[model samples]
Target: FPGVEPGHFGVCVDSLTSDKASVPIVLEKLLEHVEMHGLYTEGLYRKSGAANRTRELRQALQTDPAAVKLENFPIHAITGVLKQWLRELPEPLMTFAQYGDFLRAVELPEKQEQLAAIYAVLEHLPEANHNSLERLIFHLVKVALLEDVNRMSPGALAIIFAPCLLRCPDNSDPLTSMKDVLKITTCVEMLIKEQMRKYKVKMEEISQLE
Candidate 1:
């Protein structure tokens, strides 16, 4: 075998934080840190706006104008770990000691109901696309992400849906914005007729207002 630069293939993973008390909190903090400290384009956010990266998925979103509005919502931070700590408390109070304070501080309680509804609806979507649960959260965060993007670049909706957009394979199907799609597939011409399908929602819907 020929020789290349030693350690030519290297993976550099950045360590964001030491505290892992909350996955959601940690991810958000990291994103915010990058957005605030690191140049927006130099960070993970740039990957979201690539026309090549978000091609097919972007076109699909155009059908539903309200898709963005529907998926993106708000969050509240619960304060204190009363509930988090309850898990370690004695049985007598453990059952009653709820994370209510922290939950309320983070405003997680209010979000639960809406997220549940989003989950229910996402289940009807194609599982091959994404997990209904994660997608639901993504769209929820997308609302803010959209605002965040706009502050940096005007009308960055495409960038906002970048996560979803990046997933679709490039195709020449007339249904897609991407090139090379030969035809819409089932569940979208490949699996089933897209226009006539109930489970389907237009990409335009992603921009729906709150």
Candidate 2:
């Protein structure tokens, strides 16, 4: 009943309408393309209007597609994508170089290398599903943030969230205090600055967006 080949978007829509309860299945299938190929864009990713793909994926989790619970699944997926951005800052990306790599992640430069880099880092997560790591990225930043960073400590928080943060093949110890987290944050801050110079984007611009 697809009326066209499998690649046809219409076919995808038909399948969705026919099996409303199976949205998660369809979501898994479609998302597989993003995961198998690498969460970041490669060659065709630069194709016109690709920026919205991640946004679209994020929205899909909220409704329409799978109706899957956001907790262990979709929510964490969103977090991971945001984390890769580098603008989340202070705790992760405090430097220009780090931010630059984060920007490049969204821009999706150097296809295979970018994908490989992300895979190498996130492949170890045990959330046990496609894009689960990406979802966690969103949670990490939003976890205790809206509160004052000065009052809250990054290292201490990592210990609390580390169970979910360093899940699966990850064996590193979580941060024990804000002081330690800040040191790591400092390193990230410097790296992001280097990235700013590389992209020629003003740090102010990055600041305003965040």
Candidate 3:
């Protein structure tokens, strides 16, 4: 219900204004703040923030995302807001339509084939989803690089972000959902650890053609 409103935290990516990067301005702000202050934070996304404070920050982001200075909040709270935003999206960042494609890609036996297939699926995503996801994966790559300090490796971040990024359409069956979890996490991990920039460059190439 909340995700349907424009300017709100959970609003569909299609409804939000696209900044120069083709991502929501609010998303850009949130990711930038985390990169600036939260990269070195221990447990980072693995740690949860205060529930009430996270709720308040969520509302603040919905009301005036531009005015919400994440620096005032604890690192965990900032990470909490990022995850909350992703979870509340009506459609996950990977998009419901291509959920199956992602699952299949990740199942490939060869790592190179898996990355290539995932890149192909990424091309099918809408521009907003594509850019926003790219921004996020790049940010996660940075976070993972500081694993020595933050203890959030690419694999670790994937574990925390998989469900937030991809979901099975028929969640009615617990067994199916359970099965999909590993596939989704594997896909996210590859995105973080592999050549995500290759996809970025390919997008730029396509943009140049248009």
Candidate 4:
């Protein structure tokens, strides 16, 4: 502080402390804006794969913030990039081993029936897996709501998300992807809300400790 020049600080210090270029924060801000402005219908279809800003965004996600700025990226393409990252995660949001069980739970004939089975499955997940999963799914459910100004049903949410949200293994079970996920989309949607609630409470509790 004693020796640093204003000119040097302007050239170096400004980028590190104040940059909003991190992937999660940028997506969170954009999603917040989408929620605030009712722009879903207009923005949802823009599809995200433009190379220039997205390449920077991808690189930034993996690299140092001091190396980049929050470049002027199109909002529509941002959503695409969000989905892209989700797809590229080292593991699918749902544990691959439990997928068939999840499918069966979704196929249950009644709501409470479905709930009980799904809850049991989720409740037994390793704590680490459960936490990681709920965090991603919590945000995804939020983004899923932004499709069509919140008019889309849980089935609609499921049909869109389940394919990405769960992973299938190379097994012998007769798995029909869309039919299986769509059949249970409504119930899966129900489970996500409860999961998200639990996650937020835990987050708030953790915050209070600090």
Candidate 5:
């Protein structure tokens, strides 16, 4: 009942209104605002905004994204909403079906091999998942580039984002899921770094599809 409608905050990637790049409009707006105003803010995503203000902003975005003036909100509030949106997605940016593939890809010994395997896994993602992930990862690569000012390294960002992007099913064993945390973080860290290097070319290829 909550995320069933278009323009709602927690809708699935393919169901949300999309921009030319096929990224959810809510995500694009939040990422743009954060990149414009929050990149230099220390702790960026690591810091939480006031819960009330974050909720208010979330409602405004859900009610009418085009009418929401992000500039009026504090940078931390914007970051909070961004994270909330990701966390609330009906399906993660990386679908549940490929969760194991991502973990396995990251376990490859060499960096090149890992990247290759990861890319192969990525190729299996649904169109909306692929586009949303590309946009989000590229945004993170930019944020990490300013790690000196923001204090969010790829590792830190990965730690915060890994679970949001790749979730274990509600029925899965909690203990096994807990043990997989580090693997998930490492996989996300690799993605953030790889986006800046070889993954940039892959992203460009995706862009050309739009």
Candidate 6:
């Protein structure tokens, strides 16, 4: 709420109180805008004092009618707005207590082994949180696959996202440093589709229940 900005997606998010909103919903909308417009290429992203803009917009949402026009920002600003939302989040993508376990997930030697460990943690998440993560990562890998266009690797995507996914405590050793990014991103990229398929099946089963 505080730092949520004014763009098509940003205003949509700012439409709710921060506590009332959830990460999965925000990211779902992000992935949709990303796919609908095919915004996976590099040069498309740039930062434009987004932090201050978001804070200002949140205030304007209540005060200024001009706020509506400012919210109509361009599509490329999606990444910046998304990052700002992540930064403003009060909790990590994975809860703070489980940060270490998810960190070790990247260190596993085998690719499937790594997903198995990571999926275990994801499955144990509270229902809402777990579904959101499954969908978010599934889409993230797809977005990263435009390697030809963006020069972005799975590792690179993970590097950008892992900090948002799991926050380290007081500079405690990072789960994956830059050195391991290539290795880890490769692992995640390879396994994500399978993980996504599994999640789909799980979601179907859950849907059947209600």
Give a tens-digit lDDT track for model 2, residues 97-149: 23233334333456456545444434442222224324333323332232252
lDDT for 72 (candidate 6): 56
Per-prediction CA RMSD (Å): 20.5, 16.6, 5.6, 10.5, 4.7, 7.4
Candidate 6 structure quality by residue, lDDT tens digits, 7-97: 3223322333246545444455556666777445663333233556555544443343232344354544556666665655555545666
Whole-model lDDT per candidate: 0.27, 0.34, 0.85, 0.55, 0.86, 0.56
* lDDT string, candidate 3, 58-160, tens digits: 8888878889877777778778988989998889989988999998998889999998999999999998888889889888988887899999988999999
Worst 10 residues of 1 by lDDT: 74-83
lDDT of 1 by residue, 44-148 (tens): 232333343233322322343223231121111110111111122222110112212212222224544534433343354333222322432343233334445
Q: Which stretches of candidate 1 lie over 4 Å from their true place?
A: 1-32, 35-121, 124-157, 163-210
RMSD of 2: 16.6
Report lDDT (Cα) of residue 65, candidate 5. 86
Worst 10-residue stretch by lDDT in candidate 2? Answer: 87-96
Once fitted onto the true fold, the runs of candidate 2 whose alpha carbons sit more than 4 angstroms away are 1-119, 123-130, 149-151, 165-210
Task: Provide backbone clash counts, one per model.
Answer: 44, 32, 0, 1, 0, 1
After TM-score superposition, the amount by which residue 116's alpha carbon in candidate 3 deviates from its true location, in angstroms, is 0.9
Using TM-score as the yardstick, the better of models 4 and 5 is 5
Q: List the residue pairs that clash in candidate 4.
A: 48-77
Clashing pairs in 6: 155-185
In order of TM-score, best first, we have 5, 3, 6, 4, 2, 1
Superior by lDDT: candidate 1 or candidate 5: 5
Candidate 5 to truth, TM: 0.88
In lDDT terms, how accurate is model 6? Answer: 0.56
Inter-residue clash pairs, candidate 3? none
